[PDB]
Each structure stands twice: as C-alpha cells, then as structure tokens.
Amino acid sequence: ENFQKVEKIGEGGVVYKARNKLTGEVVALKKISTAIREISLLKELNHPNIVKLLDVIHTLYLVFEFLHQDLKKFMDASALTGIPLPLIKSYLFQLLQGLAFCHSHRVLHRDLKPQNLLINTEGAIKLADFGLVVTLWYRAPEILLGCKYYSTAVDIWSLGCIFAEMVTRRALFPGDSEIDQLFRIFRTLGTPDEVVWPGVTSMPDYKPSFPKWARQDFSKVVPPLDEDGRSLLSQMLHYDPNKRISAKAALAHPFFQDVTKPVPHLRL
Ligand SMILES: O=c1cc(CN2CCOCC2)c2ccc(O)cc2o1
C-alpha cells in the first residue's frame, strides 16, 4: 500500500508504473512458498544489464527498477531508418554480458523478446521480465520440439532472433502457432536431422513426417549485415544446443572488435 499506481505498463500478472510513497521512487510494480524462496534469491542477481528487482512483497508484488522505453517501441520508432549498426552492436554486446552473468549463476531467462529488453537515455539495455496471445517468435527449436530440460542455449537463440530483427527491421520467424514457428525455422535453416543435430529425432514432438526443406543461404536472411555479424548470427542459431555459441564465447567474437557505446535518440 506503500504504492500509488500511475499507469498500466503492460500485462505480462499486470505491470504498473507506480510511486513508492515512503521513498519517492518511481518503480515498475508487478502484481502476480517454494516460489517465494526462488523469487527471493533473484533479488541478489544484480548486474548493470539486468533490471533490478528492488523488493518482493508477499501480503505477491515484485517491485522493479523503472525504465521508460523497450526495444520493441524503439524498433517501431526506428523503422523508416533502422537502428544504426554501432547501436545494434552495442545492445547485442550488452545483452550478451547480462546473459553471461545470469548463465554463470545458472539462471536462464527463457522468454527473451524485444518487449522485455528495456533501454535508457545513457545507451544501456537491460534484461527484464525473467521467466520462472503468447509470442513464439523467439522460441528455440528444442523448446518447440517438447524438450523439458533445456539449457542456457535457449536464450542465445532468442537473442540471435532479436539481433536479426534489429538488422532487417523485420521479425525473423514470425510464427503464429508452434507448428508454424517450427516450419518457419525449418524453411530458413533447413529441416534438422541427426547429421546437424544428433538426438533431434528423439525429441518428444519430433515427427518423421515433418517436411524436408533445404537450408537457405544466410546472405539472403540478414542483408546487409557484414560477414562478422552473419558468422556470429549463424553460431547463435545453431540447431544443436550443445553447439550453439555461449554468451561468454560470443563476447570474444570478432564482430565486437570495434564495439562502442552510442547513445540513442529517445522520445519519452
Ligand atoms: O518484469 C517486468 C516487466 C515489464 C514490462 N513487461 C515486459 C513484457 O511485456 C509486458 C510488459 C517491465 C517494464 C518496465 C520496468 O522498468 C520493469 C519491468 O519489469
């Protein structure tokens, strides 16, 4: 009750912009036992590219650091011109730092998407809305194929899909059902098989009857991204999650040799 609601930000339960009546601080207020203990360990997961969880109030409200804009809105605003490459690269690099950190602490996001990447005036981008109409566009193929015990690699896939979208100004795999998501992936990357993804034919939802599409060449997928970027993107979208690049290894990729921190032009 220590909080006056200002504005509904979104329905992920519901998220409000709110003011704390004892601190003055403006926050994002998410109104939602084993879980109370999990969630409470997440208040300790602190990094400059993760949105801070300030407080967990069970009387379940989660009180987050407030950021004014998300990458989805910023991409819609940048649509006539495109986000400049040095800013794409800066955002990619920052998200990979955030992920490497989460992943080193065995925390997976599980549901990365432009809507939950938050940006500020200083050029920072932050991971929000961690997962403990549903959009499937960023889901890794092992999740779509019914794997119950998936890994940190699911987040690298999501982020590769976002990287592609920043570059092209179009969603990479805009599926509207699980099967359409999967076939859209297959149409671009090729239907996977045991040669490229050992064990694939044993995933819970794999069907031998899936149609067999041939792989497209990547130069068609994210023009006009340079070879460094396309190389990193291909490694993030590797089918086999054991071969997909880690966040740590991606930070050493040649694509980042000239990374900088530009500031974006934001209308709040
Ligand atoms: O957990 C959250 C989720 C949101 C917004 N969601 C993202 C997904 O879509 C619904 C809207 C959020 C917004 C601003 C903020 O500062 C912190 C935040 O923390």
Cα of 64 to ligand 1 centre, how many Å? 8
Residues of the chain with CATH 3.30.200.20: 1-68
- For residue 3, give both structure tokens: 């909080």
Name the residue among 103, 108, 114, 169 with its Cα closest to residue 142.
108
Minimal-distance CA residue to ligand 1 atom 13: 28
Rounded CA separation 255/246 (Å) = 15
Does residue 128 have its Cβ closer than 6 Å to ligand 1?
yes
**Separation CA 180–CA 154 (nearest Å):** 19
Rounded to the nearest whole angstrom, what is the distance from the C-alpha of residue 11 to the centroid of ligand 1?
Answer: 9
Half-sphere exposure of 253 (CA within 13 A, CB side): 23
Its CATH class, for the domain covering 1-68, is alpha beta
- CA dihedral over 145, 133, 15, 118, signed as positive or negative: positive
The three-state (H, E, C) secondary structure of the chain, written as one string? CCEEEEEEEEECCEEEEEEECCCCCEEEEEECCHHHHHHHHHCCCCCCCECCEEEEECCCEEEEECCCEEHHHHHHHCCCCCCCHHHHHHHHHHHHHHHHHHHHCCCCCCCCCHHHEEECCCCCEEECCCCCCCCCCCCCHHHHCCCCCCCCHHHHHHHHHHHHHHHHCCCCCCCCCHHHHHHHHHHHHCCCCCCCCCCHHHCCCCCCCCCCCCCCCHHHCCCCCCHHHHHHHHHHCCCCCCCCCCHHHHHCCHHHCCCCCCCCCCCC
Nearest Cα to Cα of residue 29 among 59, 71, 60, 50: 60
Nearest to 29 by CA among 49, 48, 50, 56: 56
What technique determined this structure?
A: X-ray
What are the distances in angstroms from CA 57 to CA 2, 21, 27, 43, 225? 11, 15, 14, 12, 45
Is any atom of ligand 1 closer than 6 Å to the C-beta of 156?
no
CA-proximal residue: ligand 1, atom 15 (nearest): 66
Pick from 227, 192, 231: nearest CA to 208: 192
Instruction: Look at residues 118, 10, 9 and name the one whose alpha carbon lies nearest to residue 70.
Output: 118
* CB atoms near residue 2 (< 10 Å): 12
The end-to-end CA distance of the chain, in Å, is 27
58-to-1, 5, 12, 104, 138 alpha-carbon distances in Å: 12, 18, 19, 28, 32
Amino acid (one-letter) located at 150: Y
Q: Resolution of the deposited coordinates, in angstroms? A: 1.9
**Which residues have a Cβ under 8 Å from the Cβ of 221 and sit 6 or more positions away?**
164, 172, 188
Q: Report strand pairing: 3-11 vs 117-119.
A: unpaired
| CA 125 – CA 71 distance, rounded (Å) | 8
Structure tokens at 124: 């920072």
Query: What residues does 14 pair with on adjacent strands?
Result: 11, 31
Q: Which of 92, 199, 225, 220 has its CA nearest to residue 156?
A: 92
Residues of the chain with CATH 1.10.510.10: 69-266
Which residue's C-alpha comes closest to atom 7 of ligand 1? 116
CA–centroid distance for 228 within its chain = 21
Is 12 a pocket residue for ligand 1 (Cβ < 6 Å)? yes
Instruction: Pick the atom of ligand 1 nearest to 65's CA.
Output: 16
- How far is C-alpha 259 from the geometric centre of its chain's CA atoms? 20
Closest to 157 in 3D by CA, of 193, 108, 223: 108
Atom index in ligand 1 nearest the CA of residue 9 equals 11
Alpha-carbon distance 131 to 213, whole Å? 32
224 preceded by a cis bond (ω within 30 of 0): yes
Q: Is the beta carbon of 115 within 6 A of some atom in ligand 1?
A: yes
Amino acid at 263: V
Ligand 1 within 6 A of 116 CB? Answer: yes
Neighbours of 54 (CB within 10 A): 18
CA distance 178 to 211: 15
**Residues comprising the chain, all counted:** 268
Indicate if the alpha-carbon torsion angle 236, 85, 95, 6 is positive or negative: negative
Nearest CA to ligand 1 atom 1: 129
Ligand 1 centre to CA of 212 (Å) is 39
Q: Order of strands, edge to edge, in the sheet holding 14-20?
A: 3-11, 14-20, 26-31, 61-65, 53-57
The CATH architecture one would assign to domain 69-266 is: Orthogonal Bundle (1.10)
